[PDB]
């Protein structure tokens, strides 16, 4: 079955504007600018009004697999709006049984050094994606804060940190040591 039309509309807040260059969406808000192209998906993007800034994604004559992409594009654009308005902040906790995990944040939060993971002498150097800043939280004793505008970049950096501290050749149900993403939220809480 080919559905004639599948459309979905995303509302744009007043403090943020969106510019379309074909299938390239540029979202400029208070916190920065997020630019992302969707040229791998054959949809039609349109900006509706000069009043409330609706963005409509249309798919014509699409089967099920390419109808699945409309809400994917809409969710990506909503994440871009969220990133440029409130930003993305991932809080990670380092858990350990015996050896405390010492984390050192190098220049401008772009590099993370893990020192004593499971008591080994190896030093884990994990480089954050550009635009993502890591920091050591002042509210919790073992907590990393990863802040950025791009959700995929922030979460990829968090995944790199989590996967760097991987227990090997042991029962992972018992050796629970490592750095894990505790929560995902925004900056400025607005």
């Amino acid at each position: 079955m080919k559905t004639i039309l599948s459309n979905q509309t995303v509302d744009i807040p007043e403090n943020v504007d969106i510019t379309l260059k074909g299938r390239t969406v540029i979202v400029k808000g208070p916190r920065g600018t997020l630019r992302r192209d969707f040229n791998h998906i054959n949809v039609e993007l349109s900006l509706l009004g000069k009043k409330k800034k609706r963005l409509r994604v249309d798919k014509w004559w699409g089967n099920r697999k390419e109808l699945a992409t409309v809400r994917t594009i809409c969710s990506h654009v909503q994440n871009m709006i969220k990133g440029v308005t409130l930003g993305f902040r991932y809080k990670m906790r380092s858990v350990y049984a015996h050896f405390p995990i010492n984390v050192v944040i190098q220049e401008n939060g772009s590099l993370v050094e893990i020192r004593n993971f499971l008591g080994e002498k190896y030093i884990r150097r994990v480089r954050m994606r550009p635009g993502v800043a890591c920091s050591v939280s002042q509210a919790q004793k073992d907590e990393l804060i990863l802040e950025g505008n791009d959700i995929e970049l922030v979460s990829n950096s968090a995944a790199l940190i989590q996967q760097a501290t991987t227990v090997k050749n042991k029962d992972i149900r018992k050796f629970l040591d490592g750095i894990y993403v505790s929560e995902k939220g925004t900056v400025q809480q607005a």
Binding site: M1, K2, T3, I4, L5, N42, W60, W61
Partner: protein, 175 residues
């Protein structure tokens, strides 16, 4: 039975009169066939299945094409059929949109061949009926029930790919 653009035939037959009944009953069927020869053959097949008749023991008193009474009007056709799959026999109800009943049945034969690999000898069309747009059950048919239907032609593929075969300009797909 092969195909083409099928035609509807009203085929009326009966048994030959015998010294048991001087006026045997007349039986009528709608046969969708490429031509009247195939129509008569299929009529004998079906009446042999239903009644106890044979081509040799009976005769065909009429075989005439049924012209569509409104070929200028789009309409919805429901087709009840049965067919033999590779591992059984199944009853199906399908829906199509067309101007002519014979065209709808041809659409059905092509669609059964495409979706179920069902050859025309496996398919028995047992009912064809024009249905109202509110009685339709298939979403692919129901989605065209819009008084304000509107869609573009998004990605128009070049079909004149060999006139010219060599050119300087790359084709445009947006129109």
């Amino acid at each position: 039975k092969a195909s083409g653009t099928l035609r509807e035939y009203k085929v009326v037959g009966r048994c030959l009169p015998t010294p048991k009944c001087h006026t045997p009953p007349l039986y009528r069927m709608r046969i969708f066939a490429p031509n009247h020869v195939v129509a008569k053959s299929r009529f004998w097949y079906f009446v042999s299945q239903l009644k106890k008749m044979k081509k040799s023991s009976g005769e065909i008193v009429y075989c005439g094409q049924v012209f569509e009474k409104s070929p200028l009007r789009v309409k919805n056709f429901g087709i009840w059929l049965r067919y033999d799959s590779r591992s059984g026999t199944h009853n199906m109800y399908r829906e199509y949109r067309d101007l002519t009943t014979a065209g709808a049945v041809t659409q059905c034969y092509r669609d059964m061949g495409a979706r179920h690999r069902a050859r025309a000898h496996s398919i028995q069309i047992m009912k064809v009926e024009e249905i109202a747009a509110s009685k339709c059950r298939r979403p692919a048919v129901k989605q065209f029930h819009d008084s304000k239907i509107k869609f573009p032609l998004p990605h128009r593929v070049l079909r004149r790919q060999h006139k010219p075969r060599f050119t300087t300009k790359r084709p445009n797909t947006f129109f």
